[PDB]
Every structure is written in C-alpha cells, then in structure tokens.
Design a protein around this motif. Sequence first.
Motif, PDB file in Angstrom:
ATOM      1  N   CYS A  60     -13.181  29.897 -46.502  1.00 28.96           N
ATOM      2  CA  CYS A  60     -14.405  30.831 -46.749  1.00 28.96           C
ATOM      3  C   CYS A  60     -14.222  32.043 -46.571  1.00 28.96           C
ATOM      4  O   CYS A  60     -13.402  32.308 -45.714  1.00 28.96           O
ATOM      5  N   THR A 111     -15.087  35.411 -43.195  1.00 27.89           N
ATOM      6  CA  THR A 111     -14.223  34.670 -43.615  1.00 27.89           C
ATOM      7  C   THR A 111     -13.800  33.443 -42.578  1.00 27.89           C
ATOM      8  O   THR A 111     -13.787  33.888 -41.324  1.00 27.89           O
ATOM      9  N   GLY A 146     -12.687  35.759 -47.849  1.00 25.30           N
ATOM     10  CA  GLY A 146     -11.334  36.589 -48.025  1.00 25.30           C
ATOM     11  C   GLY A 146     -11.472  37.801 -48.086  1.00 25.30           C
ATOM     12  O   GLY A 146     -12.108  38.595 -47.485  1.00 25.30           O
ATOM     13  N   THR A 147     -10.598  38.374 -48.753  1.00 24.22           N
ATOM     14  CA  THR A 147     -10.119  39.847 -48.869  1.00 24.22           C
ATOM     15  C   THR A 147     -10.855  40.803 -50.069  1.00 24.22           C
ATOM     16  O   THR A 147     -10.515  41.882 -50.139  1.00 24.22           O
ATOM     17  N   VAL A 172     -14.128  37.230 -38.710  1.00 20.99           N
ATOM     18  CA  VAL A 172     -13.111  36.071 -39.090  1.00 20.99           C
ATOM     19  C   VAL A 172     -12.978  35.457 -38.091  1.00 20.99           C
ATOM     20  O   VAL A 172     -12.803  35.553 -36.957  1.00 20.99           O
ATOM     21  N   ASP A 187      -5.632  27.965 -43.744  1.00 22.09           N
ATOM     22  CA  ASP A 187      -6.267  27.432 -44.834  1.00 22.09           C
ATOM     23  C   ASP A 187      -7.833  28.270 -45.143  1.00 22.09           C
ATOM     24  O   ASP A 187      -8.635  28.169 -44.256  1.00 22.09           O
ATOM     25  N   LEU A 188      -7.817  28.979 -45.975  1.00 20.81           N
ATOM     26  CA  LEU A 188      -9.081  29.843 -46.469  1.00 20.81           C
ATOM     27  C   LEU A 188     -10.080  28.709 -47.070  1.00 20.81           C
ATOM     28  O   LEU A 188      -9.986  28.697 -47.882  1.00 20.81           O
ATOM     29  N   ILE A 208      -3.430  34.640 -44.275  1.00 20.24           N
ATOM     30  CA  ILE A 208      -3.482  33.758 -45.360  1.00 20.24           C
ATOM     31  C   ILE A 208      -1.679  33.581 -45.585  1.00 20.24           C
ATOM     32  O   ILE A 208      -1.149  32.453 -46.401  1.00 20.24           O
ATOM     33  N   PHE A 244     -10.940  30.588 -41.307  1.00 15.15           N
ATOM     34  CA  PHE A 244      -9.510  30.016 -41.855  1.00 15.15           C
ATOM     35  C   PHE A 244      -9.557  28.635 -40.660  1.00 15.15           C
ATOM     36  O   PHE A 244      -9.695  28.753 -39.561  1.00 15.15           O
ATOM     37  N   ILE A 297      -6.963  39.851 -42.130  1.00 11.33           N
ATOM     38  CA  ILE A 297      -7.396  38.458 -43.243  1.00 11.33           C
ATOM     39  C   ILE A 297      -5.957  37.960 -43.864  1.00 11.33           C
ATOM     40  O   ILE A 297      -5.553  36.883 -43.886  1.00 11.33           O
ATOM     41  N   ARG A 298      -5.355  39.244 -44.352  1.00  9.45           N
ATOM     42  CA  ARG A 298      -4.106  39.135 -45.078  1.00  9.45           C
ATOM     43  C   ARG A 298      -3.032  38.505 -44.198  1.00  9.45           C
ATOM     44  O   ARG A 298      -2.422  37.739 -44.883  1.00  9.45           O
TER      45      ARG A 298
END
Lengths: 481, 481, 481, 481
Positions: free
Chosen positions: D353, D369, D355-356, D390, D350-351, D345, D371, D341-342
């Motif tokens: 929905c 999540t 996240g972390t 993800v 573009d996130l 970013i 992207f 996930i990280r």
Amino acid sequence: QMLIGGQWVSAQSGKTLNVYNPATGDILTEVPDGDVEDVNAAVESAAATLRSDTWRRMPPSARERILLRLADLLEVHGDELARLETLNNGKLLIYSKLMEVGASAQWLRYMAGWATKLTGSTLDLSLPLPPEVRSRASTQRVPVGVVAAIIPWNFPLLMAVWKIAPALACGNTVVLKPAEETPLTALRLAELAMEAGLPAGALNVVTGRGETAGDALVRHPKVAKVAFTGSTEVGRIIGSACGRSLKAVSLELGGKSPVIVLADCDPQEAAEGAAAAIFFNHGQVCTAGSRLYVHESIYEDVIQRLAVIGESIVVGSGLEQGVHMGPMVSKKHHENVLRHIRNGIEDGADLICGGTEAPCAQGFFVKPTIFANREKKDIRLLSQEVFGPVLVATPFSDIAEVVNEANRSVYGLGASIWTNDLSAALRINDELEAGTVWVNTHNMVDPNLPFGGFKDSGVGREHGAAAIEHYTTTRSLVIAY
Amino acid sequence: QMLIGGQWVSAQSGKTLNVYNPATGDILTEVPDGDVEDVNAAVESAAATLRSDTWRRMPPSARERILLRLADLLEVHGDELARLETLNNGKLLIYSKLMEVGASAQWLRYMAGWATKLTGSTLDLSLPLPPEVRSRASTQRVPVGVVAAIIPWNFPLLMAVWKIAPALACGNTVVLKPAEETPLTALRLAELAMEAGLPAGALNVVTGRGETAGDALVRHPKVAKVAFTGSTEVGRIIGSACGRSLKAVSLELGGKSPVIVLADCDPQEAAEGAAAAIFFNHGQVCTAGSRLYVHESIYEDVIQRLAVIGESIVVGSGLEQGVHMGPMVSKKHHENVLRHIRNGIEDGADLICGGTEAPCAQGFFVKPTIFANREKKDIRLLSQEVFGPVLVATPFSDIAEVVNEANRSVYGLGASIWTNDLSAALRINDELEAGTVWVNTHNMVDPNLPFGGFKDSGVGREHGAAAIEHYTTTRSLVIAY
Amino acid sequence: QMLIGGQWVSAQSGKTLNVYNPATGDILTEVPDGDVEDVNAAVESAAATLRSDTWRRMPPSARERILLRLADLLEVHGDELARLETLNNGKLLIYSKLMEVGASAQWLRYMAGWATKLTGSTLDLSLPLPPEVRSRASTQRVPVGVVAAIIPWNFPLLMAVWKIAPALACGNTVVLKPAEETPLTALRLAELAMEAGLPAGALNVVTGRGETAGDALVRHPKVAKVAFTGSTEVGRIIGSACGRSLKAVSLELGGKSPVIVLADCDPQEAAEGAAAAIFFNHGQVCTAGSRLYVHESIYEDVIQRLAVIGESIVVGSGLEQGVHMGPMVSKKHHENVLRHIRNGIEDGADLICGGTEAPCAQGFFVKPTIFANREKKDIRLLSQEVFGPVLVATPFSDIAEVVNEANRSVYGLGASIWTNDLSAALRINDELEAGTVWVNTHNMVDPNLPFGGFKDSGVGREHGAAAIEHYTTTRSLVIAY
Amino acid sequence: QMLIGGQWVSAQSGKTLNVYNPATGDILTEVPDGDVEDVNAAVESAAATLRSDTWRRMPPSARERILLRLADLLEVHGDELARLETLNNGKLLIYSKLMEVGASAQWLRYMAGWATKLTGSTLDLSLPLPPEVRSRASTQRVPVGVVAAIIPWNFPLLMAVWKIAPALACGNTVVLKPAEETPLTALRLAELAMEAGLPAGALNVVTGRGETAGDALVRHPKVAKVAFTGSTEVGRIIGSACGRSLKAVSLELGGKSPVIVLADCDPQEAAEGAAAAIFFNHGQVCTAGSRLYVHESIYEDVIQRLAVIGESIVVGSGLEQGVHMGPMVSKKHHENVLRHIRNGIEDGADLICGGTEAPCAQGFFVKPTIFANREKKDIRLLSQEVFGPVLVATPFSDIAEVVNEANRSVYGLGASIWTNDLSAALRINDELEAGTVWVNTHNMVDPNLPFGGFKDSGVGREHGAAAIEHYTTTRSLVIAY
C-alpha cells in the motif's frame, strides 16, 4: 493474669473464666474475668503513658525499633506461640507458624517502617492578610490517643497485631481485649512487647466475657478510637455508642463473599480455587467465599470435582499429622454452624458433600459441606454468614445475572472472578459492590493492601497507607509574620 | 420553592414556613416546610442519578468544568446573591460579596481541581502464590454515595459550597438542607448549578424545620454520608444515628477558641487582633475567639484599647453605609445571646464594653460586649459558646497556666498566640489541644487548609486534601495471572 | 580484595595501591588499583543480577529484611567497623561508633521500610474512546537499573550507606567506588551485605585511583544512574558525560555555608553554636559553616568566646583519650588546607585563633583556625571551600546585608540563623538561597529529611521521600476494554 | 513579531525568516530570525520577573485564575487558532479544533488546579539534640526558575501548552522557542496569556533558526531548566551542555513504537487498530506505531484489511472537505520520509500500500505506505524513525519472540497489545521495555497520565503528578527550639 501498667495482675473481683482446647473440648486454662474496675485501670494507664513525655516524644526510630525487635521476638519465640494458637484456637500447627507467627512478624516490620515516615503538608494559602505580611501554613500528623482494640477469635495473634502494630507505629497507646474463647496469644504478645522495649502502659491487655469488659472499654470517656471486628450486629451497638461519644471507630463486620467462575476458566483450577476460597481456616474467615457461582456450561463439571476435593479433607486435631482441617473455636459456634447446615437441608438444597455427622469423637468438629443450589431457589443460606466450612453453589447464564446476585447481599467485603477474559474480569469488577475483588485468587491479604468492605461489612479501611490515616489525625498551624 | 430532580417543587403537604429579614424583623418570604415525603423523593433522586451512567461515568474534566462554570456564575450573579445574603442573614453587604460570593467561587475552583486528580495506588505484594504466578494489586478511589448535607445559618452560601463543592468534585451526589432561618442562597445555588451543566438530581435542596426534615435526611437508608455543622448537642444525635446505621459522618460542632497575648506583643496590635478575632461576623463563627488571655504586664493596657475599639463599632442594617456590625440571624439566637450577657453580669464580671441594651429599634441587634475577668474566676461566659459578640478577657502570669486554661475546655477547635517569640509560640502550639492554631492572626480559612477540631468540636477534617479522603473511599483489586 | 559477583577478587593487572593512616602517616594496607577491565566485570555483574528473576521479582519484604539484617550486623560488628574508620579516616572513635556505625544502621532501617511502600497511582482519564469503551490507567513504580555510586572520604561507611541503602530498597543493584584515601569500610560493608542475604552481584565494590576507575564507571553504557559526591568541579565532568549519555545523575557538590547571629541571640550560645557548626568532623563536611556573620553589637563578644573554645580544642589521634579533633584524611588535603590558611593571612585577615604550625609530630594535623574579617574585605577565602577547620568571621549592620552576603556565593547548600525572632528567622529563610536552612542548629541530617543544594552545590535531593523519587521511575499502563 | 517583556519586538539585526503553508508550498509569512542578543533580553526578562514579588509572591489562586482565564480564551478564540494551525502545520482543521485548541484548553485547566495544591512535608526526626530541645522539620516546594522551552512542529499549540502550562502553574517563568517551521500559534498563545492576566516577562517567545536561537537558550547561565522535545540526536547535545551546566533537563526524544496483535484478537479490529496507531497525525507522532507485529495465524487476514484502509485514505489540504490526511510540515521532512520509503523498497520489503508517488500537485504530501516484512529481514526501516505515514508489518510465532523484537530497539517510548487475554496482556507488559503501554488502544495521552520513555527516548516524565516534581524542587527547614 493480665497486663496493666507493666504489671501482671488478676481481676479485682478475683473472678476468673475458663478457656478451652477445641479439639478435646476441655479446660486448657483460666484467665481473668474483668469488669469495669479493670477496664478503668487499664484505660487510665494508657492515658498516663500517652501523655508521658517518654512516649509522646520518643524519637521516631526508637518506636520503629521496638516494633522491629518484637517481630524479631515473635519469630524467635515462634514454636511456642504456634503450639499456643493450635491449642487454644484449633488451627493447624503449620498455619500457626506461617500465618500467625509469621505473618504477624511481617506486619510488625511493615508498620514499623511507617513510624518514621509519618508526614503532614506544607501549604500555600490565598488569605489574604494585609501587605508587608506573609504567612506559612502546615498540618502536623499527630496520634489519635488511647485505642480500644477488640479482637475476633479466628486468628488471635494476627488480628491483634493488625491493630496494635499500626497503633503503636503511630504513637497511640492501646487497650486490647481479646475474644473470650481465645486470650492466651495476646497475653504472650503483651509481654514480648515489653521485652522489645515498649514502656509500661503502652499496651494493656484486659480479659473477660464480651458482654461487660467490651462495653466498659467502648463507653470509656478516655478511649479515643474503637477498633472492633466481629459480629456485624454488635458493630451497630459500638457504632451508636461511638457516635454519641464523638469517637473515631474502626469496624470490620460480616461477609458473604461470592466467587464467580466464567465459561472459559478451567474446571480443575476453578474447583481447586473454590475449595481454597472456603475451606481455608475451616471457613472461619470474614472473606471466605461461601457463595459459589459457576456458569451453566461447566457447572456440573466444577461441582463434581469440588466434592472430590472436600470429601478428601481429613478433619482432626491441629497437632496431628495428616490432617487438613481442624475444629471450630467454641461449642456455641459449632452449634450454630450445624444449625445452618441443617436449615439448608430443609430448604431444599442438594447435599453433595458433608452433613452434620461428627467426624470425630471429641471436639467442635464439622465436616466440610457443600450444597448445590440448582434451581436457583433462594434458600437463605445465601444470606447467612456461617463462618464455617459451608458452601452453596449456584449456576448462572449471563454475566449480568451473576453480578446482580453477587450484589444481592447486605454485605460487601470481597469477591473473586475466575477468567482469562480481560474485558469481563475488569467489567465485573467495575460492577461489583465489593471492597476487595480478587481475580484468580481469594483470601489474599498484605500489610500494604487496604482492606475494608462496603454496606453492612463495616466502616473504614485497615492496612497499608489506609492505616496511617485512620490511626493519625492532623493539627493545622498558620503563622502570620 | 425547592429542588428535586431538576424540578421546582412545593411540599407535598402544601405546608410552608416563614423566613425573615433580621434587620427589620419582618417576613422576607416563605419556603417549603418539607417532611419525610419530600426528603424521600429527594434522596431517591440522587440515588437514581449516582447510579446514572451519565454521572458515574462522566469524564473527569467534565465534572471539573461544571464546577468551574458555576464559580464563574456565582461571580457573574454576584451583586444579586450578595443582596440576598444580607437580606436573609444580616451580614454586611461587602462581606457578602467578598466572603460569601467570592470565597465560595474560590472554593469551587479549588475543588474543581481535584476532580481531575483523584488517585489510588499501585502496590507490591509479598503473598504469596505459587511460583510462575505473578500478581498486580491496586486500589481505586471511588465516590461515597448520596450525601446528606446540613448547613448552619452564619454563612449560608459559603457553608453550602463547603460541602457541595467537594462532594460533587468526587462524583458524589448530594441532598442539601439549609438552616430554616436561611434557605434562599442555597436555592439560588442549586439553580445556578444546573445552568452550569449539572445533571438533574445531582444536587437537591430540601427545606424545612430542622426537627423533622433533618431527621428524615439522617435516618434515610440510602444516605451514604452525613455532613453536619451546628449545635454540638444535635451532633451527638446524628452521631448515634449514623453509627448504628454504619454511615460515614462529618461533624463540625462547637468551640470556645482562646486567644493568647504574650508579654512582648505590642499592645495595640493585640487589641486590634482580639477585636478582629471576635467581632468578625458579629461573633457568629465557630472559631471566634471568645476567650481573651493577656499577660499580667500589659493586661490593662490591652483591654483599655480594646474597649475603645468595641465602643466605636456602629451596629446597623447590612445595606447601610457606615455600619460595621449587623444583627443576629434569628430572634431565638438574639435572646440566647442576651441571656448569656446577663448571666455574665450576675456572675461578677466587669462590663467594660457592651451590655444588654438595644442599639436599634427594630431587629435582632446586640451591642458588642466585653467582660473583664480580673480575678480569674470561672464564671460561665467561659464555658458557654455564645456565638455572638461577647468576649471574656482574663489575665495570666505563667505560660503554663494559660495553656492549662486554654485546654480547660470541652472543645478544641482553634486558638491564637500573639508573639515574636519563636520558642514560646511553637511550644505553646505543641501543648494546645486545638485543631487549628494561628499565630498573629485568627479566623483564617483556606480551601487548601484542613479544618476540624478535637474533643467536643467534632469528628473529621474538612478542606484541602482532607476533603478528598472524606468524600472518597477505595476498592481494592488483586489480579493473579 | 574487591568484590565482584560474590567473589573476592584482585585487579586483573595485579596492580595495587596504598591506603594510609592519617595520624601516623604510614601504610595501613593495600587495595586493588582497578581499571576498566574491572569496572566492566563489576558492571556486567550487576546487570546480570538486576535482570535476575531472584532480584527483580524478590518479594518486597524480603528486600526489606536484607536491609534490616544488615543494620543488625553493622551494630553487631560495630566496635570493629568503628576501629576501622578511625584507623583509615582519622575520625574520633566515639564518632565512628555513633555517626558512622550507628547512623548507618539507622539509615538502613529507615530505607528498608520504604522497600515495602513503593507506590504508583491509579488514574482517571478524559480520553475519549468510543462509547461503551471504558478504560483503566495506572503508573507503576520500577527500579532505575544499575547504580554507579561514588563516595567521598569524610564519612566512608555512612556516605556509602547513603547511596546503597536507598538503591537496594528500590530494587536497583549498585556498583560502588569508594574514595582512594578510604576503601576499607565499604569492603566490610559489602561482605556483611552478603551475610545479611544479599544475592551475589547486587553490590559490587570496585577500588582504585579516581582518575581512571571513576571514569570507567561513569562512561559505562550499562550504568543507569550516577550518584556522585565530591569536588564540585569533577561533578561538572560527570554532568557533561551523563547528559550525553542520557543517564540520571545525582550530584552533591561543594558548600560555603553561612551562619548568622542576630542581635538578640545569646553570645555564649552563638559561639558554642558556631564552633559546633565548623569544628565538627574537623570541618570536613560539605555543610560546615565556614562563614560566620555576627551582628555589630555582639560581634566582639562572640568572637572572643569562640577563640576560647577553639584554643581549647586538643588535636590528636582518634583512638587516644582526651582528644577532640583528629586529622585530615590525606596529605594532599592537609597541604591544601594549609595553603588556604596561608592565603588568608596574606589577604589581611586577623588570626585570632590557630594557624599554620603543626600541632603534632606525625600526621595530617591542622590547628583549628579562626580569621576575623573585621573591615569586610572580599578576602577571597570567603569564596573558597576549605573542608578543614577554618572559619572567617565577619560583622554586619542590617539584616538585608547579611542576606546579601550569604547569597553572594556560588554555592547554596545550607545555612543557620540564630535568633529567637520569629519574623526575622522565617523571613531570612524566605530570602536565603540555601537548600537546607537550620535555625538554632547546624549540620543536622536525618534519614527522613531531604538534602540537596542550589546553584553550584549540585543537582537533586538525597534523603527521605526524595530518595525514592530519584531511585525509581514509573511506567504507564492504559487498558482499553 | 516576537514577545519579550510584554513587548512586541523585532529582532535586533532586523533579520527575519519565512514560514510556509505545507499544502500549497508558499510563504505564509515571516517572523523574527533571532540570535543571541535576543535570547538574552528574553532570558533576562524572565529572570527579572521570577524575582518580581508580583510573581513570586502571587497568591496561589491568582496563578490558577490566569491559567483558567486563558483556557477560556483558547476556546473563545478557537476558530482562529484552529485555522492558524491548519495553515502553518497542515493538520486537518477539525483536529486543530479538537486536539490543539481543545486539548490545550484541557491541559491548562488541569494544571491550573495544581497551582493550588503544591505541597511539601512536615517531618519527624531522630537527631538528637540535647534534651530540653525539641525541633520541627519541613520541606517547602518552590519553583525551579527560568524555563527554556523548545517545542516540536507536529503539534505547535499543544506541545507549547504541555510545557508552559505546567511551568506557570509552578511559579516558574518561561522562555519559549517554537520550531522554525511553525511559530504562529505560540505567538498568539503568548498574547492571550497576557489578556488572561499574566504579567509581562512571565512568558517570552523567541523565534529563529534552531541552530543558533536554540543554542543561545540552552547555554544561558540564567536558564534553570531545559525542556526539549525533538530529534533524539540534538537531545544528546542538550544533555551534554545541561549537565556541565548543572541544570535540570527534560527530554522527550524519538520512538519506534511496536504494536502487537495476538492470536485471539479480531482482524478487523486489529487493522482498524493499527491504521489509527500510525496514520493519526500523518504519522508525525513520537509514539506512532510504526512497527506492526501480527501473529502467524491471522497475519495475512490483518494486512489485507489494513491495505484496504490505507488505500482509502484521501490526502489533501487541511481545510478541504473529504480529506483524511494532510501533509508533512516541511519540505526537508517530506524528502526524508520519501528516502525512507525508498530505502525500504530496495531493502526488499513488500509494498502492499502506498509508495513514493505524489498524491497532489503542490505541497509536501506523502501517500500512506505499508511495507510487509514477511521473511523477517532486519531491513532496518524498523530501526529508523520516519515520523511519517510508513508502516512495516512483520509476523511472529511465539510471544517470547515478539517481545524480544519489540525490545530490539534503541528507543522504548510506547507500545500496544491487542488481545483479550489477561495473562498474556499483563505479562506482555511485564516484559516490554516501553514507558507507556496501551492495551487495545494506542496514542492516548491525558493531562493526568505521566509520559516518558526509556532508553534513547529520553530522560524524565511529563504529565500528571510527574510534572510537578519536575517543575518544582524543595528546600529543607529544620528549627531547633
């Protein structure tokens, strides 16, 4: 002369019968008018040979090679067999070369490769015999016996390959009766079979009027299977007879294939689609799409175009250049096709294209005819198999409506859906009572695709891996050791 | 009372008919004497339900689970169904429990397994269509429709499973008619079918005299296949009818299974072999080995022992202890079996065991009878199917002669060879015209072994992977994209 | 020259290597000594062509025709290819004509007929989507990709057609490496392939020393399957490499086939049986029956006769008349075969026939040798594949111990039982750990019979319907609508 | 403890290891930390039993009944096994009951019916032995041997059934190693297997850290096949090892399934489609559709809706009500999923929905999540299998570009097309390099549908009729008589 036992032989009565050229309408030749004397020799000769060790126990690559060498001789002798068909049948020469000489060679090859791949099974079994005992159990694919093959007149060379090719692959011997309107190409077939290495008696060809030669063949105590294609009525006669005889039966009878154009389909493609679906082989095809169903929205658009297409078909001799359609095969069928055109005008349908006016001076010629059934009046040309170039084109609002109409037939052999709509296409095919649906095509046949119909269109399946099961059977063997 | 639509229903005429116990020749009960009114309802009810989306589109593990649940309920209800058979059929109770309750449950399971595994093919295609136009072809295995099932009286529970189990696996619905001498176990079958989750109408059971209920079932326009087993004659009636109807037909008719003892085979292992081959199910078995052929060398040795074996069979009620054989199923069959024993004494064969005298005081009992055909005369206990405990034992010098004698029959259903001789065993089996040869056994049937006969013994095969090909058919689909 | 892309091409280094004639051991010719430059071109060329629309989407009767024409051109060019083999391999000319030219043509034909019969399935599905959500699910047989084919030197033409014939049927393209002791007949194969209509790149032939050409082929990222046959050791190198590569692998490695003569078998037939089992192809056969086990009773009788048979084999050139056996293929194998003969004399076995002396003046000739291992010592020639005409013949008392001994091998490819005992024969076959048992024969291979071994003899099966499953794979397709 | 020989046994070292609850990060229990001592007992015990006549020669309806009685005990013990899964795995209780207890029972049933239907072939043969000698040739389906089964942690009960069910059907015995993060449901499986009638030793369960227990299992000289599913890397290790071992290998490795929304597809159906394609099983699924490709026209429409859907997923314990998604299975996988996930970013996506941030206070929870990859950057979140919730959603203009992007992956396991265009859909499927395409669905698995991937996603196919070719092999038998 006919073939019985490797021998070109005439009828024991020395009676004979005329074959014609449907374009000029004259005698082309004569062939033997065989009776129950000469079905008998021919069927006793195949049973001779089926039991012969030289056929029964012919290694399996030797039977593959005979069928291989003859496909190689249909193509080497292929201008002559193609002129022959065109002469006797009326069919366009290029289609004789491509769809009779050339598709026939393709079916041989294909079925010749089965000759070598015919298998049974090897099984478990919970018996359960006493202990200290064991068992091994198998089935063994074996041939059915002597095959009575009766062939229709629309594709004489092919429709005879379509039975002999798969029967011989299997180790069956055959007695073949061609239609009386067309015997010549099967006679040539039989003698090329022997040039290819087929032993005498393995393929006999008996000729004659259908009423008697046929009956003798069907009712013979040594005939093991009957493979017929023709009138769905005569198929009933064969059925009854075969079932009290306890013999296997293959029956490919009539059709009234519907063709269905959905809202989103292109009008030029649909009308080019329909014309090919019903003016192919002058409409003389079990699966010809003789019922056209087009959606309300584009109905007129479609039938407009379609009459441009059929108006522009040139009818003529099969050996002439510039000709697109040829004749009917006989004068009885020509007369029957014209009677159906005529009941259709009286039943109130709209002649948009065609009629009963003779396109030529000599011959069994019909103009390609389209009837528009706007107003959904069930004239009953929607029920009649014509087997000629005649189309009825009706409209429809819902998809449920069209499906119902497609399955308001006593026959069920084929059908087309024209669409780029996945759901609909697949869910129409779901609900159709048709044995071979096409999507965005029609009339497509392959050596690997099984073929048959539902309802009144017959019993059984014809090609592919369906052939093998219908021309073979099994014996079981269980050894206790 | 009979089943039609989930409903226990009487006949519309209110007419009825007696079933009996064959041991104490007495009425056991009554059941419906149905006619063409009540075949009608039952066949319209299965057609209702075959079109049912619940049944047509039932996921395939749900139809597997119904057949599994009901094998689980044949075995849970299995003392009662086994007393039932023994009561109605005469059969020994332990064999009711093992070969009717227990082999049936095994059949269910097995066929329940193929519910889930019914496949078509996905095919190449050398067509062809224009370039830039690709196609996909397939066939799709589908059910045959409404099944007319007519069951014989020798194994009432099992013979019924043998049909319903494979028809229901496929997605067919069935209308089942049990013999009139034995209807009770199929009635119980039907109600356990519904306890297992089978929807109303999927299995109907109609009852009645064979002459009329039967005929109505066969000649119904909505019956799609006919699966009969019984008299080979009546099979001919069904054949004729089914073939003019264009319907699929399964027919398991007569036999006269030979059994062959070669020179090297132990002699007591042969006579124990033959006795089991023909006194199993009081000889009431299509495949019972009613012709014994023993080599010249050990012929007498063998038939001596064999009469010791048959002399020592105790005939009695099926629920009594100490009993090895029971009765005939009806008094008409008892009388027919005794007439054949009697023609055999007049035709000059040697009664070494058995005869025409009654073992018991009440009931349809026959003594196990052996006739020695020394002298190799063609009396008529050799060409007549008895279906009772009667054996003719003839000798032979060559192996070629015995093979010829085995295939001097109008039927070819089964056969046995008894031998440690690989060449001979396998080369006898080569030359026999029998649909299921056993080696060093007889009468062995599995759910995975196909079964059928040649000649006058029927058309078609029954079990295994032969059952799916006979209870399914295919539709083709070719998409041009 | 070598073939890559329709092109007869030399190696990029220009380096070259000698091929020889085993009978007069002199240079016959030279061929390319290819390296990883020229495996690469060849493997990039097949991948070009596999993706080729022409080849990928070649109708299926067109790929059947190519393989058919080229069986037709092996046989039309068959005196020349047969002189070629005999020259390069040493093999008797008649055998070249029959078992290399003629079995090769038979294998083509057979596999050419599968080109048109490659099918997936059409499936039911308990899912379960929402309602009103219907689905259709199939698998589609597709080709594996680029095939790396490495061929052994004992049957150069045939062993090559064993791999290319089935790969091309499937729609795979191939890169073929022949042994370095024999490249010529595969070079001719490749150019006849193109005369038959095979598109450039579909069959490339790379040549070279095994160490490097081989490795390059195996370790290529665009090679999809590896079909190897040879040393069982090198097979484990290929294994490791193929498995970390995630590529499919076909491996036919070593054998030590036992042959078993039971008490009742005739001594003249057994010894004629054994000689054919191990002096066929000069013993240069994976499945050659190099261990003889004869019962105690007739052991001497059998080995007496057998030495008469082997003493009378005349060793000579393959084009000379009167010759029964020819040479070894190379001088390294000749030397290895002679070291094993020699180890065998030191290990205390009885030389009853043959030895280590040279039959001829020039060439890689070995005399057919038989060692009698009376006393049953683990004379460790019973663990070593020779691949030459060397037999060890041991005796045995119980059938349980012969079975033990047969399966005291690290291989398990083939085996023979000689007997006429049904129980024993089938039951031995029950207990043998051999992948292809023969009874009263040995060394029998068909195009329709699957072939493979157990244990250290490889992974996978080779012919029949086992080919298609090893040269095809499936993709699944599930459509929700 | 563990199972080895019918015996609940601890590890020989007495060493042990902790299993956890993934919702409340706590020890749930302990299980054996087995080593190469205890893989060995377990593998010697299955080999004992495979050779067992009790198991080898168990009639085939008895092995069908064991698998039948244990599907019946998965469902009778099904609340407990479903609480168990949810406890150990984190999975929602209703999905434990439906997709682990209930799909597992379905898989048993299905494969149990193939126990009964395992067949070889019966074959023709062009040999050609002398004249006077006839031959009969068959193949016999047999089991592969001892099965090493290594199971992944995402579906512990089911993934285990997936292997043991088909191995036991075949007559193979198995040694099963569950993941170390989840061993409990396979332990229960094993003891219910014995309650159902499975003989001791037929299914052993060894437990332990993957590094060592695993290796020992793979490298065992008596293991005949290796069925692994997990990290595609470790699969390479197994490959190498298995191939130098000459053992059969089943490998189901990684995926990056793309999902493709065409222009005409409805936006709310597509976004409901995608969410189900990747938030099913918390994205912990080989086939999860982790790459979303939507057409330019409706791209934003679709991803808007989709973030509404994922924003509204409630993450929580698997036994709590109102929860839609649960946790990751371990804390190492939680940490790996969060690292991806990280990187995403930082790689400039573009996130929209998720996240972390941690949704809960305790446990291995991740927020779903999404992207958005507008700008079409190879951010390489598309090149990395996450196995968590993800998604990367990219747009596309022509269909040729999306196809190219779908096949710009190193794995080709599955794929979806969403459309109602027949041409496009079929064709997209034509050009995809994916082993199981779905149309208007995703993630659909049957017992009758074969499953496998192309490229780096493994070797081999898993279900259906593909199972029985991968868990069986054949031996050939050719008898000369």
